[PDB]
Amino acid sequence: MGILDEVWKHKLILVETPDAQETSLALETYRKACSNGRGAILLSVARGKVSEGIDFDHQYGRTVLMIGIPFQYTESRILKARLEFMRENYRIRENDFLSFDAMRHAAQCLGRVLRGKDDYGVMVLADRRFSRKRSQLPKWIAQGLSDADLNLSTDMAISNTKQFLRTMAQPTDPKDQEGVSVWSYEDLIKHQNSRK
C-alpha cells in the first residue's frame, strides 16, 4: 500500500525477527537511532522476545501503540485442554481466563516505558474490545485512564497526544513535588512522625 514509505520519512523502521542475534542488533540500532535524534519506530510482538525484559525507559519509549488485544489462538488444542481443566478444577470461566491472559500481556508492555516519575509517555490501545477492559488493567494504569478515553477516534486521539506531549515539556514546578511525590530526608522524618 505504501504506508511504510511515509513512515520512513519521519522515523527509521526496526522490525523484530525470529533470530535472537538479529533482534538484538535491531534494539541496538533502535536505541542508537533514538539517542542521536534520527528517530526510530520498533515493531514487535506482545508475546515476543522484546516484551519479556527489554525496557524502553525515557527517550527509547515515548509512545506505545498496542495494536489489538494480544489474544492467544483460540483454535488450539493445548489452550482448549488447559481452559477446560481450570473450569472444572478452579471454577474459572474460559472467557475470564482468556481475557486475563491477554490483558496480563498487554499491561506488561505498557509498564516498560516508565522508569521514574520524570518519565512520560502515551499508551494507546487500538481495539474496540479494550473499552470494557478498563477494570482488568493494573490499578496504577486504570487510575490514570479517564472516563472520556474509553472510546476515542484516530483524529481525536492524536490531538490529545499532541497536547499532552507539549504540556509535559514545560518545566515542572519544584514546589509541586517537594513533599507530595518526592521526599527528602527531612520530609521522610516528618511522615514517620505524623504516622506515629
Partner 1 sequence: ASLVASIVEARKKRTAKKNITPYQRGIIRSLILTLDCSEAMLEKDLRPNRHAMIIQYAIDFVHEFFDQNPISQMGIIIMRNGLAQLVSQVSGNPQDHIDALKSIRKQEPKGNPSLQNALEMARGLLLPVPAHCTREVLIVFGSLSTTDPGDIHQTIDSLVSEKIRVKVLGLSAQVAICKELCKATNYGDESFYKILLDETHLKELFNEAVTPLPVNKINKGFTLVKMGFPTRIFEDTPTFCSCHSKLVYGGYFCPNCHSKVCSLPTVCPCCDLMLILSTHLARSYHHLMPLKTFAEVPTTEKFRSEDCFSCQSRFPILLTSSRYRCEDCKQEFCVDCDVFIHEILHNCPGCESKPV
Partner 2 sequence: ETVINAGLPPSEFWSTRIPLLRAFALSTSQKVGPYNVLSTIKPVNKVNVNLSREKILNIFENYPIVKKAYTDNVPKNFKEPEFWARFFSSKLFRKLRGEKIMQNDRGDVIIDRYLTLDQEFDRKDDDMLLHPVKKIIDLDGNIQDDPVVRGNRPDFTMQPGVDINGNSDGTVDILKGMNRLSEKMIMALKNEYNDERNELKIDDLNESYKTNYAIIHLKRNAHEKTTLKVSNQQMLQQLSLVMDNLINKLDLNQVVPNNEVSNKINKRVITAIKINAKQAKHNLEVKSTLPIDLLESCRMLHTTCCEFLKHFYIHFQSGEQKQASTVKKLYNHLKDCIEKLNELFQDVLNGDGESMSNTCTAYLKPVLNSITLATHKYDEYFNEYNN
Q: Tell me which residues touch partner 2 (CB under 8 A).
A: 4-5, 8, 12-15, 17-18, 20-29, 31-33, 36, 38, 40, 45, 47, 49-50, 52-54, 73, 76, 78, 115-118, 174, 182
Nearer to partner 2 by Cβ, of 15 and 142: the residue is 15
Contact between 162 and partner 1 (CB under 8 A)? yes
HEC readout, the chain: CCHHHHHHHHCEEEECCCCHHHHHHHHHHHHHHHHHCCCEEEECCCCCCCCCCCCCCHHHCCEEEEECCCCCCCCCHHHHHHHHHHHHHCCCCHHHHHHHHHHHHHHHHHCCCCCCCCCCCEEEEECHHHHHCCCCCCHHHHCCCCHHHCCCCHHHHHHHHHHHHHHHHCCCCHHHHCCCCCCCHHHHHHHHHHHC
Nearer to partner 2 by Cβ, of 117 and 132: the residue is 117
The single residue among 11, 47, 82, 134 that binds partner 1, judged by CB under 8 A, is 11
Q: Which of residues 19-58 bind partner 1 (CB under 8 A)?
A: 34-39
Contact between 171 and partner 1 (CB under 8 A)? yes
Nearer to partner 2 by Cβ, of 79 and 92: the residue is 79
Query: Which residues are at the interface with partner 1 (CB under 8 A)?
Result: 10-11, 34-39, 59, 162, 165-171
